[PDB]
Amino acid sequence: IPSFQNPNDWVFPWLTQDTIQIAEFYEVVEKKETAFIYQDPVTGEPVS
Amino acid sequence: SAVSAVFHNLACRIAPDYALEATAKIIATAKYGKELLYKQTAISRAKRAPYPSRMPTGSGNSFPNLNEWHYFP
Fold this sequence. Notes:
Chain A is low in regular secondary structure. Chain A contains no helices and no strands.
């Protein structure tokens, strides 16, 4: 039954029964990568 | 300062008992005197009553955090 702190108004010209919230956070890590080359045995083409 | 008013109003009221009626200076000072005693009171009672049931909350206002001013403020 999570919350954030309520983004919504506390004036409340109406009040809905449940409006319970959860926050999806996005953080950045570059990570990257290298190599990992293979061939395709299906109808030729190496260096995939 | 309340002395200078009252004794004129008092001397008028007990005058018919003595079969007399107050002179022009006594009734003039009596009315002007009691008016000066009420002068400070009528100044302090002046100020407009709170805003009506329907009044904007404005958008020139910065963060009022309320909608409607009813008899709220």
